[PDB]
Paper text:
In low G + C Gram-positive bacteria, [name] is a global regulatory protein that controls the transcription of numerous genes. [name] from [name] and most other low G + C Gram-positive bacteria is a DNA-binding protein that is activated by the branched-chain amino acids (BCAAs),2 leucine, isoleucine and valine, which may be viewed as signals of the metabolic status of the cell, and GTP, which may signal the energetic status of the cell. [name] from [name] consists of 259 amino acid residues. The structures of full-length [name] from [name] determined here reveal the effector binding domain and the DNA binding domain as discrete entities separated by a helical linker.
This pocket is distal to the site of the leucine 3 to serine substitution that resides in helix α1 at the N terminus. The ligand carboxylate forms an ion pair with the side chain of Arg-61 and a further polar contact with the main chain amide of Val-100, whereas its amino group forms polar contacts to the main chain carbonyl groups of Thr-96 and Phe-98. The isobutyl side chain of the isoleucine ligand projects into the protein parallel to the β-sheet and is surrounded by the side chains of Met-62, Met-65, Phe-71, Pro-72, Tyr-75, and Pro-99. The domain topology of the isoleucine-bound [name](L3S) tetramer is superficially similar to that of the unliganded wild-type form; however, the packing of the chains is significantly different. Following this superposition, it is apparent that isoleucine binding to [name](L3S) is associated with displacements in the long α5 helix and a significant separation of the two wHTH domains in the dimer.
Author numbering: 1 to 258
The structure:
């Protein structure tokens, strides 16, 4: 079966990872295992989204890149000139994934370059590198399957962010729209009278201070809480603990300013 197993091994990981937010290191690791090579998933601008090392490289600059999660601008920018997979590039390629200062320490340095194509776009580049061993057709299939698969995920990552923002904004709209003029004013205060994402406050105290009805402060909080913008614990003899669940909310409360 040979290749059939490994290809499923990928599929396996992908289907495990649906549900959890995308993880690139884990994806890189899986590829490294099935392919038996160094894996680097590089963004359009050199951000190492994730990477897995199959054989360490004693080179301090290389060592920094992996720490800093970044590859040289020049090096990265030139990868977009690779339109299709370019396989088994020696140590003398501009595109080699091994250090150039030591082209003798890695004579047997083969780098394969595999574009990552998303929704019909070049999302990034999957770089594979190893010492000595050639990248055969059977290896190449697993690189390209892998690339395609990583491309899905890069796209899902954004998909989920923009969807989550959408959801957050909605909440804020729910809340704001539900609030009466006076209540809104009151909220502006309560959030003014603290500075943080959470905190405690007695409405009775706030009422007399700023000259607003206990009543409204109290209904105002009730609406925010029903929207999902916060959660409140009645703290009995003294006030009510208040925890903002929506970051976006308080920013919104500035934007309108009169
Ligand atoms: C990771 C980049 C590699 C090492 C490239 N050949 C360079 O020397 O910058």
């Amino acid at each position: 079966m040979a290749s059939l197993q490994k290809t499923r091994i990928i599929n396996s990981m992908l289907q495990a990872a649906a549900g959890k937010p995308v993880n690139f290191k884990e994806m890189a690791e899986t590829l490294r295992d099935v392919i038996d090579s160094n894996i680097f998933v590089v963004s359009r601008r050199g951000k190492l989204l994730g990477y897995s090392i199959n054989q360490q490289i004693e080179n301090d600059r290389m060592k920094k890149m992996l720490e800093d999660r970044q590859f040289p601008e020049e090096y990265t920018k030139n990868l977009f000139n690779v339109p299709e997979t370019s396989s088994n590039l020696d140590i003398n390629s501009e595109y080699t994934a091994f250090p150039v200062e030591n082209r003798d320490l890695f004579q047997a340095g083969l780098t394969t370059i595999v574009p990552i194509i998303g929704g019909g776009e070049r999302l990034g580049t999957l770089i594979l590198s190893r010492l000595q061993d050639q990248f055969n057709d059977d290896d190449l299939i697993l690189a390209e399957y892998g690339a395609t698969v990583v491309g899905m995920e890069i796209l899902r990552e954004k998909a989920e962010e923009i969807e989550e923002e959408a959801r957050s904004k909605a909440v804020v709209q729910m809340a704001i729209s539900s609030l009466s003029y006076s209540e809104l004013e009151a909220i502006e205060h309560i959030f003014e009278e603290l500075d943080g994402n959470e905190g405690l406050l007695v409405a009775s105290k706030i009422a007399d201070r700023v000259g607003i009805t206990r009543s409204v402060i109290v209904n105002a909080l009730r609406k925010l809480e029903s929207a999902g913008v916060i959660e409140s614990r009645s703290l009995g003899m003294k006030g009510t603990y208040i925890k903002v669940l929506n970051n976006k909310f308080l920013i919104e409360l500035e934007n309108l300013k009169s």
